[PDB]
Amino acid sequence: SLEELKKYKPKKTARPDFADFWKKSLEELRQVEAEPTLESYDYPVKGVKVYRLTYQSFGHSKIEGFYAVPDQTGPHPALVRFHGYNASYDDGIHDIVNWALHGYATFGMLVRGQGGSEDTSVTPGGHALGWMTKGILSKDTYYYRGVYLDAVRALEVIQSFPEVDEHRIGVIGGSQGGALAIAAAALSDIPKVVVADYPYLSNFERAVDVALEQPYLEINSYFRRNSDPEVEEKAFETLSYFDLINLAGWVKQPTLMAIGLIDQVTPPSTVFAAYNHLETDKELKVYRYFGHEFIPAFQTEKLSFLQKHLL
Amino acid sequence: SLEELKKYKPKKTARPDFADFWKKSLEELRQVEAEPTLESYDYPVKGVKVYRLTYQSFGHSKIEGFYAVPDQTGPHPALVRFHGYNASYDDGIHDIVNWALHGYATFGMLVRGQGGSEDTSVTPGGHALGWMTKGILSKDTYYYRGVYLDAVRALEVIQSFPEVDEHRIGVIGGSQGGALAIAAAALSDIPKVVVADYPYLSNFERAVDVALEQPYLEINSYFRRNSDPEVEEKAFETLSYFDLINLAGWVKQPTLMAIGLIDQVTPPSTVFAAYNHLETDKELKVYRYFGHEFIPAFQTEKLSFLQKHLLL
Amino acid sequence: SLEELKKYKPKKTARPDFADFWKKSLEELRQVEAEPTLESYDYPVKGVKVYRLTYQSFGHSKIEGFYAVPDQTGPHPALVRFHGYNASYDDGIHDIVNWALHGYATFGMLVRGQGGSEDTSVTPGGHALGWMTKGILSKDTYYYRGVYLDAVRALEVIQSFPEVDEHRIGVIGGSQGGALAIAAAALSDIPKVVVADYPYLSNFERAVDVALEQPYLEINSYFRRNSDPEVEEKAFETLSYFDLINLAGWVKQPTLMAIGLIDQVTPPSTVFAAYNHLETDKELKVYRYFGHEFIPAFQTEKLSFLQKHLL
Amino acid sequence: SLEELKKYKPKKTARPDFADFWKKSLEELRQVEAEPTLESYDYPVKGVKVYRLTYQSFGHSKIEGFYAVPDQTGPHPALVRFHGYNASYDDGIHDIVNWALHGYATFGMLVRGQGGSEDTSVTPGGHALGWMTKGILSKDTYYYRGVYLDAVRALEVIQSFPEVDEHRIGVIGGSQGGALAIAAAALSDIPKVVVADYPYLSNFERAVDVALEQPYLEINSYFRRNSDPEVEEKAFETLSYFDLINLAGWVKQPTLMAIGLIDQVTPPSTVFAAYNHLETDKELKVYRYFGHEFIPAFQTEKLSFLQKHLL
Amino acid sequence: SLEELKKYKPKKTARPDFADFWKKSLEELRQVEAEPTLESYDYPVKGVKVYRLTYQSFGHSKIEGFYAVPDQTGPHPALVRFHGYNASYDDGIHDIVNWALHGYATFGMLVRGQGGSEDTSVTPGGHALGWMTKGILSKDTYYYRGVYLDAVRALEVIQSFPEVDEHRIGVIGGSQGGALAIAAAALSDIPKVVVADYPYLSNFERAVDVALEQPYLEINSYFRRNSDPEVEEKAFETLSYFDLINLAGWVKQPTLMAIGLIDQVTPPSTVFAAYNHLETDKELKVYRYFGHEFIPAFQTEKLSFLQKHLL
Amino acid sequence: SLEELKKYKPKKTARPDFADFWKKSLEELRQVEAEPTLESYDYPVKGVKVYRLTYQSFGHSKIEGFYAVPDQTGPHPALVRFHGYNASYDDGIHDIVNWALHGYATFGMLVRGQGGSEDTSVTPGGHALGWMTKGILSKDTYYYRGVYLDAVRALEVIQSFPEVDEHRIGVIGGSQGGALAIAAAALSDIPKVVVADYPYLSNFERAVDVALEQPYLEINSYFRRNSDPEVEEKAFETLSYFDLINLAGWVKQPTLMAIGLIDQVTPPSTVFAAYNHLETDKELKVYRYFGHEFIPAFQTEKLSFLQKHLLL
């Protein structure tokens, strides 16, 4: 039942050069000067100053997002917030401001291409409607390579802000956001804490047999349009470099996760898989009656978690 | 009412610099050497030789697709076939081969990003899931700018083939394919004939109000994510440069169209709009009981049309 | 079509005893002591104290909800927030706390029988699944009679709080919440300002013909079960006593509204009807591409509106 | 599948005070004077007289329903018919008349609050849309407490009629009706026979995990709105007092049941559970190709059963 | 809109040989000997005898159906009941008995091919899934030709029964049944009265444009498979011979009809068309909130209608 | 589940008189004179002549379909193509012509009542909407009896054509077509090869429990209307005479099959069952990401298969 799920630890797909690909990709990122930029932005709020933050990342694409700071003498604890797949509305400015009102200097990084950042990477060949399969035929060209690296830089940028306490930076997000939170934490020692609501991009090879809704199906859709058995092999190969089950091993920050047992977008199994590959101070909140949706009960859970580690 | 539809002809949205934009765009295309590449490809068919065709286009992107030729001494009539939005399966090789079996040296151009070509253009900023709104904030960066230009070059490349009779080249496609067929014909004098099934990318400002299905709704979806009123204005502005109702005026080739009266993807009105802006030897086949789908009746219609004009 | 909607103003359905019914109801409510009850409640937030607020209302029903106050020297501006139909999750505590973080001592009243309050009123006879048609055969027994009165008292309770500035109280809500916001403002002079998102319970006689989704259809559903032509007559009769188009006339507070042109739950026409019956400093924000859902662009709209009038 | 269903008999959930609760409840019912009322009702039929029957029950609620009697000298066998959840159309008068035409003095009790009767019980707090979770936080306040008691009284009233043969009274119903039929038989010795189609309100703790359709889902829906873990425990606690698997033990009348193997409203397992807890002259008609719908085959089955035992 | 519907009366499509076709068809029917067959059948009811009735009709096909007679010295009024399209379950026996219990010697004719009679007519060529388009390319071969004639014979057979009062025979049915009821009445003087619930087979040329649900869509479906435009014309040509709007002119019996304004199977317009083409003593009961379904209110309506005219 | 599926081989349901029934049925077919008729038909294609073929079959019913022949000196390899359940649009003329363009003299038999042949068989009693349950109460009256026999005759007719090489006739089809292909091959030695995509009419007793889509459900639907337990008994009895799992044993021809693992119309299990009852040179192509739809990958598979065996 859910007993078999608590025990599920798929086999990892990481390839021999897993660490070298990421070490090499971090070295390309280091190659690009951040050139951070700040610009005050007016919003109807009291006790919080809002800014437009800009910096340069992998491939020289310009990343953007709103940066809200508690209107009070710092230094402050900080949060880098990551939005969901194709679910960024008005740059999620309202959520960002609210986080700042909670006492966190928080930056909502917009995911290149979807949110309002720039994706500089060429599109090698055809792919299914969406971002999931863009550059899927090579880990060098894969969409999430750039985005993952953008997350790391996000942390590098804010960490340098005088108002930010570099030792009290948290990384949070839901679905796609949760995956970026984990990936970032796995690739960077900057974040002190991790909060992922039902994380995405996890256990691709199973998520494909079990998901009943977009956008894990984009992969299936891609394979329907490209039947080449070699294509499928290469695709799953490049996907393993970004799969949470392979990155979870590198996370040593205390991390809190959530999952709804009727979630059809991000199937419970895929989330448990990720969780069971974490070997760090961790916890998984399980909600029997919720799917891929805002879970009230968990909200208050992560507020405590964050307060107890960052405030 | 078929009556109301038959008389529907919306005011053009073409901006004052419409012609200049395309002249400048064509000049950027001319800037890139095609340097075409051919490579024999094995396929279980007799009487037809299949190839992988490659060439360079706008932004120096490698454009590809299968090229099937009747295995008989030419020169042959030629077809450049354009596939539907997100509807290219295995490069539509089977359809291409079949066209060749009909006596046409035919090339199925893969649309950069979706089919199997290479889209070299940067992604300026955010956009809705899909290609519809990529680079939507400027006609210079818009997704279909590159693709339109790829279509023109496709014609330029195959037209230079010794086995191809440059005087007997047709351009065909359905939905997105039909739009590319028309656009290509509008921007190039190479094609002698045009065949468009329920054409896409037409009458954007109405499509967004009548479409009950994807993906004219990616535009709507894009506006939901970007509420700025200035964004909507700019978006529709850049869209007018690619809208069939503005390009139809340039088509002088004999062109045949189809439309199903229950089509919810590519609404009848948007297709009539395009048709009513054509000022050329034209015809619109109307099918009361069909939607956005293969229309058997029209298939035989376009076979005759093509045979009469290209197999003359 | 926006043009037809802009000019749409249906004839009022208010019966001749409309005013008397409400005077006599507001009077039965005066009959009940409020007997408020405050109780601190722990919540992972800084700068805000959270309470459980209790009070007695019409019928001797005990109404409840969370009350969050800015943890800073009063007095503060106040908001009474009303939740949507069957859409109260965990008493919407997270939203309430967030409002307090914005500088508003805000109370989220739970709708009797729906959200967490007590509905003391008998159920006269059969009715369709839901609250819409409960006690529908008489304006004395109708479900929303009690709830409307609960809203008025809500204002009466918080207004008496020493930390609350009685002359800076706002009333807000979406859908059902928006209707309660308007109704409350119409029946009470306490609220200084009104914000309603796609308001509900408006223009019943048309809603039943244009609604393609629940719950306006509960009325239709009720008539299918009770074919008696008299029943329909009586039903629409009692409904007119609660219809926004009949109450809008009494609203003298500056009020801000929103409506999405593809809203199928709360049809644009029904909302315009309400708006066009307001005779006060008013504004209607129209969103072409939105339905019955959170509208980001409007959230910032009401923040300004509230800030300029209450802060 | 059928094999495992036949042998499915979940452990009872009846709490230690199960019997006391019902003894006390029956005592409260006895406290209220029946004072039943009859009123002739014209209906286009021959060989039958139709009446409107009224009486008082738990909480002082006036329960009603059409009462049709064979227009022939008595005494007659009698049936107390119970309608389905939210499925009472025009008081199901046509079905009632038809039963009378079959030779049964039959009364169609309308379920208080939904069918066409009065529910006098207060609504303690919030609950999910529907009746399922009304007063769910206490067995004293739970919705079906009153309704169950109404069923018992129904039998007490029609049993006192001179035209009714008290020794030949049957209790029948489908879904919700079937549950009331069984519950009534379990709480009263009046009924000689029981016939229930795919009975409802059975094996709650499993129903909530297998139901793919309303309304066993109102419970799930209720928990989504009230995440408190205590709430769920209390809810299932109060539900056990009304669960058929706990009441079936008291049924000593010959009883006939039906179940369709593709029923998604009232899952086969939940019905088998009830059946396997009956310890009397029981029979279970199983229909492989039917769901939650009128089963023609079973219709003729129960006609024989009733004719055999009552005519 | 009820306004527009009330006045809707499309031009007849009857071809010039309309009358001749039916005269010739009736002649062919007369050519076949009824050789009726009655066989007692056991059913759990009292006061009613049930039989299996058999007779021969057009094309030498054996038509069947249950025949229930009031177990009391006749002669009795009689009803020939026609079932819905693909909606005959167990020969619809339970309803035939219930009609007998109302004092009517009633026969439920099973429609050939669907119900349980025998369709002897060859299938000329391809057609869409269903009966709608079987033999559609010629009025001689069309499916409903045989069925219509079966209905006429049904009346001829039962009328000859000694227990049946030939002067008091009614014809009733819903949807397909209603169409057969009307058609039968139009082609035979035997029936004294007609009751059709939302009749089918009417205004084919519009039905195909307004129907949002089966089975009028079978025609559309047939044209998708056979694009030949001459084919659509021949089809509509043969259909006119069976269209109610063309037969309604021959009905001189008092007839009662019903229609639900949200009916999507049998669109209101098509039903109004039929009723506006009736020049007999007619009446149309209109139900705003009902679709293609059992309408309680109308049930009692037709009971009175039948009782007044037949009892 | 591929491992469980690969080993799935349900016990045959063939009744003791299985062989006799088919021997007797074939005898009745032989009783009817072919009397085949040919009629040139116009179609916009070069290198192919199209005809409308007519002949008489079981019950003296007229069976028909288009017959396309490569416009050249034969003899040619031949294909009998069978269409899907209720899925014959315009007699599938375009597909037939395309097959001819591939070098095959191919005949698309229209299934009686569906595509365009005549079903002379009486309808014994009631049945569920559709053809599935027509005459279901007896194997003598069952719908597919006639159709199966029509398939055999189809082979007998085309085989007699001078332009057809009787030694190189293939039988192909998808879903219902695949079942007819297999059935035909099982009842006739004429066909040299068999290609069936997601075959239908297979493992009825399980299909009715796993099918989430029409039309295996017509059977379920039929039982809902006829609750008599003796009806279900008789129904499954008559169905066993036409179930592929019982016929597969007779197929000697090399046969190629396909199945998509997410097929809900024709469940994988039912198809594996059929495949595992084949005792011949066989192969099953399995596609993980496809359902009951055109599978581009398998298309090219069967082209090779057919080319190797028929075009040598």
Q: How many other C-beta atoms lie within 10 A of the C-beta of residue A268?
A: 19
Q: Which element (helix H / strand E) includes A157?
A: helix A143-159
Measure F69 CA to nearest chain E CA, in Å: 23
Task: State the chains in contact with C (3 or more Cβ–Cβ pairs under 8 Å).
Answer: A, B, D, E
- DSSP-assigned states of every residue in A58-76: GGGPEEEEEEEEESSSS-E
Q: Nearest to residue B198, comparing CAs of B254, B143, B274?
A: B274
d(C-alpha D204, C-alpha D13), whole Å? 10
Between chains, do D288 and F227 touch, taking CB under 8 Å as contact? no
d(C-alpha A139, C-alpha C266), whole Å? 48
| Annotated binding-site residue numbers of E for substrate | 85
Between chains, do D224 and A297 touch, taking CB under 8 Å as contact? no
8 A C-beta contact, residue F222 and residue F164: no
Asked if B98 reaches chain F (Cβ–Cβ under 8 Å), the answer is yes
Among C43, C101, C307, the residue with its CB nearest the CB of A101 is: C101
E-chain residues within 8 Å CB-CB of C224?
Answer: 289-290
CB proximity under 8 Å: E 12-51 to D: 43-47
d(C-alpha E159, C-alpha E168), whole Å? 9
Among D103, D299, D300, the residue with its CB nearest the CB of E46 is: D103
Beta-sheet pairing, E37-41 with E48-57: antiparallel
Q: Strand, coil or helix: what is A222?
A: helix
Interface test with F, best of A208, A227, A230 (most F CBs within 10 A): A227
8 A C-beta contact, residue E154 and residue E109: yes
DSSP letter, residue A110: P
Q: Strand, coil or helix: what is E155?
A: helix
Any idea what the Cα angle at residue F112 is, between residues F110 and F113, rounded to 5°?
110
C-chain residues within 8 Å CB-CB of E289?
Answer: 220, 223-224
Structure tokens at B175: 């939905």
φ and ψ of A106, to 5 deg:
-120, 140
Asked if F297 reaches chain A (Cβ–Cβ under 8 Å), the answer is yes
Between chains, do A227 and B129 touch, taking CB under 8 Å as contact? no
φ and ψ of B202, to 5 deg:
-135, 130
Sequence letter at residue C114 = Q
Among D83, D127, D277, D292, which one carries the catalytic annotation?
Answer: D292
- C150 catalytic per annotation: no
- DSSP-assigned states of every residue in chain F: -HHHHHT--PPP---TTHHHHHHHHHHHHHTS----EEEEE--S-SSEEEEEEEEEEGGGEEEEEEEEEESSSS-EEEEEEE--TT--SGGGHHHHHHHHHTT-EEEEEPPBTTTSB-B---B-S---SSSTTTTTT-TTT-HHHHHHHHHHHHHHHHHT-TTEEEEEEEEEEETHHHHHHHHHHHH-S--SEEEEES--S--HHHHHHH--STTTHHHHHHHHH---HHHHHHHHHHHTTT-HHHHGGG--S-EEEEEETT-SSS-HHHHHHHHHT--SSEEEEEETT--SS--HHHHHHHHHHHIIIII-
- DSSP-assigned states of every residue in D173-223: EETHHHHHHHHHHHH-S--SEEEEES-SS--HHHHHHH--SSSTHHHHHHH
Among D263, D269, D277, D309, which one carries the catalytic annotation?
Answer: D263
8 A C-beta contact, residue E154 and residue E173: no
Q: Do chains E and B touch (3 or more CB pairs under 8 A)?
A: yes
Rounded to a whole number of angstroms, the CA Rg of chain B reads: 18
A-chain residues within 8 Å CB-CB of B115?
Answer: 126
Experimental technique for the deposited model? X-ray
Structure tokens at C36: 């408020």
Interface test with E, best of F109, F129, F222 (most E CBs within 10 A): F129
Q: How many other C-beta atoms lie within 10 A of the C-beta of residue D232?
A: 17
CA-nearest residue of chain B to E210?
B262
Q: Which residues are bridge partners to E109 per DSSP?
A: E82
E-chain residues within 8 Å CB-CB of C220?
Answer: 289
Per residue in F75-111, is it b (16+ CB within 10 Å) or e — as a string?
Answer: ebbbbbbbbbbbbbbbbbbbbbbbbbbbbbbbbbbbb
**What's D185's domain CATH number?**
3.40.50.1820
Interface test with F, best of A210, A218, A221, A224 (most F CBs within 10 A): A224
CA distances from F99 to B101, E79, E226 (A): 10, 58, 21
8 A C-beta contact, residue D80 and residue D158: yes
Interface test with D, best of A287, A289, A293 (most D CBs within 10 A): A289
- D277 catalytic per annotation: no
- D281 catalytic per annotation: no
Q: How many CB pairs under 8 A join D and F?
A: 8
CA F163, F165, F170, F176 torsion-angle sign:
positive
C-chain residues within 8 Å CB-CB of D86?
Answer: 128-129
Structure tokens at A233: 């092999």
Task: State the chains in contact with A (3 or more Cβ–Cβ pairs under 8 Å).
Answer: B, C, D, F
Between chains, do F126 and E86 touch, taking CB under 8 Å as contact? no
Task: State the chains in contact with B (3 or more Cβ–Cβ pairs under 8 Å).
Answer: A, C, E, F
Asked if C227 reaches chain E (Cβ–Cβ under 8 Å), the answer is yes
Asked if F224 reaches chain D (Cβ–Cβ under 8 Å), the answer is yes
Structure tokens at C231: 């029943």
Cβ-defined contacts of E71-74 (< 8 Å, 24+): E71/E46, E71/E47, E72/E47, E74/E105, E74/E162, E74/E163, E74/E164, E74/E165
Between chains, do E98 and D103 touch, taking CB under 8 Å as contact? no
Structure tokens at B105: 């040296």
DSSP letter, residue B10: P
Domain that holds residue D223: 1-311
On the CB side of B196, CA atoms within 13 Å amount to: 34
Sequence letter at residue F274 = A
Asked if F2 reaches chain A (Cβ–Cβ under 8 Å), the answer is no
Is C289 assigned a ligand-binding role in the annotation?
no
Between chains, do E223 and B289 touch, taking CB under 8 Å as contact? yes
Non-local CB neighbours of D169 within 8 Å, separated by 6+ positions: D77, D78, D79, D80, D155, D158, D159, D190, D191, D192, D310
Q: Strand, coil or helix: what is B234?
A: helix
Asked if A227 reaches chain F (Cβ–Cβ under 8 Å), the answer is yes
Between chains, do B297 and F90 touch, taking CB under 8 Å as contact? yes
Resolution in A, one decimal?
Answer: 2.7
Q: Cis before residue A77, ω within 30 degrees of 0?
A: no
| Domains held by chain F: number | 1
Q: The sheet that has E105-109: what strands, in order across it?
A: E37-41, E48-57, E61-70, E105-109, E76-82, E164-174, E193-197, E255-260, E282-287
